[PDB]
Amino acid sequence: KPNVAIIVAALKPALGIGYKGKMPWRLRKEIRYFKDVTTRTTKPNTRNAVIMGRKTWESIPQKFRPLPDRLNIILSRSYENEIIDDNIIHASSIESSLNLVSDVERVFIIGGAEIYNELINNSLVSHLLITEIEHPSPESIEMDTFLKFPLESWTKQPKSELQKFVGDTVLEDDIKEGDFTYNYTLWTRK
Ligand SMILES: NC(=O)C1=CN([C@@H]2O[C@H](COP(=O)(O)OP(=O)(O)OC[C@H]3O[C@@H](n4cnc5c(N)ncnc54)[C@H](OP(=O)(O)O)[C@@H]3O)[C@@H](O)[C@H]2O)C=CC1
Ligand SMILES: COc1cc(-c2ccc(C)cc2)cc([C@@H](C)C#Cc2c(C)nc(N)nc2N)c1
Numbered sequence: 001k002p003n004v005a006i007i008v009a010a011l012k013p014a015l016g017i018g019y020k021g022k023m024p025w026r027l028r029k030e031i032r033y034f035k036d037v038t039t040r041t042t043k044p045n046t047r048n049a050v051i052m053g054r055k056t057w058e059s060i061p062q063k064f065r066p067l068p069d070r071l072n073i074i075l076s077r078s079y080e081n082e083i084i085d086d087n088i089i090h091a092s093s094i095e096s097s098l099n100l101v102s103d104v105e106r107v108f109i110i111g112g113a114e115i116y117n118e119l120i121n122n123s124l125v126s127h128l129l130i131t132e133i134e135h136p137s138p139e140s141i142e143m144d145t146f147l148k149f150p151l152e153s154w155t156k157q158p159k160s161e162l163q164k165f166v167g168d169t170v171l172e173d174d175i176k177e178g179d180f181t182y183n184y185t186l187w188t189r190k
Helices: 026-038 054-059 094-096 114-117 160-168
Strands: 003-011 014-018 049-052 068-074 089-092 104-107 124-136 154-156 175-177 180-189
Touching: 003 026, 014 054, 026 049, 026 124, 026 175, 049 054, 049 094, 054 068, 068 094, 089 094, 094 104, 114 154, 124 160, 160 180
Parallel strands: 003 104, 003 124, 049 068, 049 104, 068 089
Antiparallel strands: 003 014, 124 180, 154 180, 175 180
């Protein structure tokens, strides 16, 4: 079984990720980081998979779906475990989707809230790619959906380990867009 990882961007310290079905920020560089990391592979003729909840899939703009160069896995409790096309798979669970995929190097859980909060405690998930976002006044930002992540049982890895994981991908420190400041982090289980 290939390595599964959670990729998310959240605002400290309450780890908020959204407000009424949409993200409370537009971080141009973070968006680019998300695309490169979930797309790049190390071995030839392989591709990564992106697993998401049905609601997240529907929120993605028509021309951006499915996410290009990646296998899109959409999760719903009403779906049968079946391959829709070359890039789209419907599944009722992550373990069921892993049995249908082929030539998949890395798997990335990309949201949303219900998906994160109920897969963070799944043994299949071994890595957390959290983009920690800081703001002068976090409470000033409208938020209603948060992450229920027990980071207590996780360990913040050194930047060098994240660099190894992302390869030649540029990792900048304290990226400042507007009033937001963020960093890319890698987490592993205790
Ligand atoms: N900052 C970030 O990195 C990101 C933030 N977000 C935020 O997340 C929010 C949306 O989250 P949310 O509304 O929870 O949407 P989700 O993507 O989590 O959709 C939830 C749906 O997924 C399906 N599902 C949930 N759990 C399971 C399971 N265990 N097995 C199979 N299917 C399951 C269900 O589909 P069904 O009802 O059909 O059975 C459910 O309705 C937005 O506000 C957005 O801003 C999202 C992505 C990234
Ligand atoms: C609301 O419509 C959306 C659009 C995109 C999207 C579409 C195209 C491109 C090039 C980049 C992102 C992604 C999303 C969701 C799936 C996400 C995300 C996510 C992020 C942006 N960063 C990090 N770090 N983790 C994530 N899961 C929703």
